[PDB]
Amino acid sequence: DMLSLDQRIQTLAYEELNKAVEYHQAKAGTVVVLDARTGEILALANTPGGRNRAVTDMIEPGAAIKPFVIAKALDAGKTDLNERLNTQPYKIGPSPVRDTHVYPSLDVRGIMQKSSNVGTSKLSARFGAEEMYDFYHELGIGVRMHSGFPGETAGLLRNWRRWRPIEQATMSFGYGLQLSLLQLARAYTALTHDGVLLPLSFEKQAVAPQGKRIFKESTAREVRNLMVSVTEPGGTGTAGAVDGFDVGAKTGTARKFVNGRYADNKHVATFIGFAPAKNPRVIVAVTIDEPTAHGYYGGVVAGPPFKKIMGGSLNILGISPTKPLTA
Ligand SMILES: CO/N=C(\C(=O)N[C@@H]1C(=O)N2C(C(=O)O)=C(CSc3nc(=O)c(=O)[nH]n3C)CS[C@H]12)c1csc(N)n1
Ligand SMILES: [Cl-]
């Protein structure tokens, strides 16, 4: 049998996912676990029972898309690692562009670490609309996965000719475009596989299949290091840190679109990360739908199951820790 599924990881993922969903009294949840070098899908878990939401359900990614805007800006030389960007909030007409805190300025590392919508939108604004549209398209947004499961759709990437000026701003921190958790996890292979986006596979891969280069290898390596700051003190994703490893991750918290408004009530909490951060072996992605108890942010809600799924996955795959254990 040549199937990529690993039953121990799949069982680990399902149990931790259901604990998190129950503890936060959430409506639903999904997990994807990938081989970070080949794109093999090691686990897909969904709750409550029924359809494969990891493949079928399109979500807005929120700040989980920010790593790719930051990488693109660095890759194209439109920013660097020492620029400090004014990150004061502002508005375009009625629409605000603001962070949860007012940071007067941040470098690119701070934009990632703090999850600055303002910083990301200003980096994105250095590109034209059609450029960015093509960029989201080559990340696979709007491109069907052909996983073999029914109910799968391509996702949403609106035509660039219809973008209002505010739209390109808000798309850069995860508004307006839609993708499945599988498409989102797939995009993170461009960061783990040294700039090369992988197709993903449900069968064991003897080699890493031929991918498509999105970023230079140096860009991917620098961005992975920025993402380690997310799980260290000062970042939004400390709940996902794993003993004996450096973890690059990104949190996301998206207001749900109820009828015709973005609810300040209901949220989707996402945590996606990879380890070992220098030479990744595993990607773990977790999305918790509408938590109602014990917090609703991505770090607090989906961070804890990420940490237990990642740590156990590395243990199951025999990945040696890169630094002394302290737990
Ligand atoms: C509620 O805001 N709605 C947004 C949006 O701007 N989301 C951004 C995003 O991904 N965010 C994240 C985060 O990184 O988790 C955060 C997390 S900050 C945080 N994390 C904790 O774990 C914690 O205990 N406390 N705090 C303060 C701010 S909302 C923002 C949105 C984007 S698309 C969409 N439909 N909604
Ligand atoms: Cl490859």
Author numbering: 235 to 272, 286 to 574
Question: Please, what does the article write about this entry?
Answer:
PBP2 is an essential peptidoglycan transpeptidase (TPase) that crosslinks the peptide chains from adjacent peptidoglycan strands during cell-wall synthesis. PBP2 is comprised of an N-terminal membrane anchor, a putative pedestal domain, and a C-terminal catalytic TPase/β-lactam–binding domain. The TPase domain of PBP2 contains a central five-stranded antiparallel β-sheet surrounded by α-helices on both sides. β3 contains the conserved Lys497Thr498Gly499 (KTG) motif that twists during β-lactam antibiotic binding to form the oxyanion hole for acylation.
In order to verify that the reduced affinity between tPBP2∗–H514A and ceftriaxone is not because of a loss of a direct His514–ceftriaxone interaction prior to acylation, we determined the crystal structure of the noncovalent complex of tPBP2∗ with ceftriaxone at pH 7.5. tPBP2∗ crystallized in the same space group as the apo structures, and the precovalent complex was obtained by soaking crystals in a ceftriaxone solution prior to cryoprotection. The R1 aminothiazole ring inserts between the protein core and the side chain of Tyr422 of the loop following α8 to form parallel π–π stacking. The C3 dioxotriazine ring of ceftriaxone, which is normally released following bond rearrangement upon acylation, forms parallel π–π stacking with the side chain of Tyr544 of the β5–α11 loop and inserts between Tyr544 and the loop C-terminally to the α10 helix. Finally, the β3–β4 loop adopts the inward twisted conformation oriented toward the active site, where it forms interactions around the aminothiazole ring of ceftriaxone, and its conformation is essentially the same in both molecules of the asymmetric unit.
